[PDB]
Design an enzyme around this catalytic site. Structure first.
Site, mmCIF file in Angstrom:
data_model
loop_
_atom_site.group_PDB
_atom_site.id
_atom_site.type_symbol
_atom_site.label_atom_id
_atom_site.label_comp_id
_atom_site.label_asym_id
_atom_site.label_seq_id
_atom_site.Cartn_x
_atom_site.Cartn_y
_atom_site.Cartn_z
ATOM 1 N N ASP A 149 30.492 43.392 143.529
ATOM 2 C CA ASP A 149 30.898 43.290 144.928
ATOM 3 C C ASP A 149 31.142 41.808 145.217
ATOM 4 O O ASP A 149 30.342 40.937 144.826
ATOM 5 C CB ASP A 149 29.817 43.837 145.853
ATOM 6 C CG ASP A 149 29.553 45.301 145.645
ATOM 7 O OD1 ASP A 149 30.443 46.041 145.215
ATOM 8 O OD2 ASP A 149 28.427 45.727 145.925
ATOM 9 N N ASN A 159 34.175 46.002 146.520
ATOM 10 C CA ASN A 159 33.979 46.448 145.147
ATOM 11 C C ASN A 159 35.171 46.373 144.186
ATOM 12 O O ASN A 159 36.294 46.765 144.530
ATOM 13 C CB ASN A 159 33.391 47.860 145.152
ATOM 14 C CG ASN A 159 32.878 48.275 143.800
ATOM 15 O OD1 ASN A 159 33.525 49.019 143.088
ATOM 16 N ND2 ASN A 159 31.736 47.751 143.418
ATOM 17 N N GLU A 170 25.785 42.361 154.562
ATOM 18 C CA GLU A 170 26.383 42.481 153.247
ATOM 19 C C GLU A 170 26.296 41.176 152.475
ATOM 20 O O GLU A 170 25.959 41.172 151.300
ATOM 21 C CB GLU A 170 27.857 42.878 153.349
ATOM 22 C CG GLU A 170 28.112 44.330 153.707
ATOM 23 C CD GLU A 170 27.715 45.294 152.599
ATOM 24 O OE1 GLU A 170 27.393 44.827 151.487
ATOM 25 O OE2 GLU A 170 27.728 46.523 152.840
ATOM 26 N N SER A 204 30.529 47.458 137.937
ATOM 27 C CA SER A 204 31.436 46.834 138.893
ATOM 28 C C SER A 204 30.683 45.735 139.657
ATOM 29 O O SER A 204 29.465 45.660 139.577
ATOM 30 C CB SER A 204 32.025 47.882 139.847
ATOM 31 O OG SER A 204 31.037 48.420 140.724
ATOM 32 N N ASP A 222 26.950 50.495 137.694
ATOM 33 C CA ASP A 222 28.108 51.045 137.001
ATOM 34 C C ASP A 222 28.969 49.957 136.345
ATOM 35 O O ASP A 222 30.013 50.251 135.764
ATOM 36 C CB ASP A 222 28.942 51.876 137.961
ATOM 37 C CG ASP A 222 29.552 51.047 139.102
ATOM 38 O OD1 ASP A 222 29.527 49.830 139.041
ATOM 39 O OD2 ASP A 222 30.052 51.657 140.030
ATOM 40 N N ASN A 259 26.755 45.744 140.174
ATOM 41 C CA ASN A 259 26.229 47.075 140.347
ATOM 42 C C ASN A 259 25.906 47.676 138.998
ATOM 43 O O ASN A 259 26.372 47.189 137.975
ATOM 44 C CB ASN A 259 27.259 47.928 141.073
ATOM 45 C CG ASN A 259 27.597 47.378 142.440
ATOM 46 O OD1 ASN A 259 26.715 47.106 143.241
ATOM 47 N ND2 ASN A 259 28.876 47.200 142.709
#
Length: 129
Positions: free
Chosen positions: A52, A59, A35, A50, A48, A46
């Protein structure tokens, strides 16, 4: 901070992640590797809108507040920046809520695609735990 494999395993263990919800320590170390490459400061935006954050790429849409993700739920009640700290406690406490949410570790896409069903024991091999 860029953690070493065994150094991270020890911090997560001390954090109560070993076998938390039935997931052995190797699972958590494997997920962190894929990750964030063991880097606490990693962030990724991301599509959308958002983002991370941190070692476990938590998120902003559901778990933390970054002030720029409309509809964010902030279920961990914490600013996303707290997840980038060298002290992994916040990431660890939030991850416990996420993994308990019903879908277990499948909540982390790199875990599902790269760790799940593999010999995760290899990730802690050699470490003095």
């Amino acid at each position: 901070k860029v953690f070493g494999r065994c150094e991270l395993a020890a911090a997560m263990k001390r954090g109560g992640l070993d076998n938390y919800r039935g997931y052995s320590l190797g699972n958590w170390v494997c997920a962190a590797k894929f990750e964030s490459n063991f880097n606490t400061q990693a962030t990724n935006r991301n599509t959308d809108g958002s983002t991370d954050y941190g070692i476990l790429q938590i998120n902003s849409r559901w778990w933390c507040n970054d002030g720029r993700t409309p509809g964010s739920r902030n279920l961990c009640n914490i600013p996303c920046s707290a997840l980038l700290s060298s002290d992994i406690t916040a990431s660890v406490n939030c991850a416990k809520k996420i993994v308990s949410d019903g879908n277990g570790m499948n909540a982390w896409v790199a875990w599902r695609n790269r760790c799940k069903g593999t010999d995760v024991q290899a990730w802690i091999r050699g470490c003095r735990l």
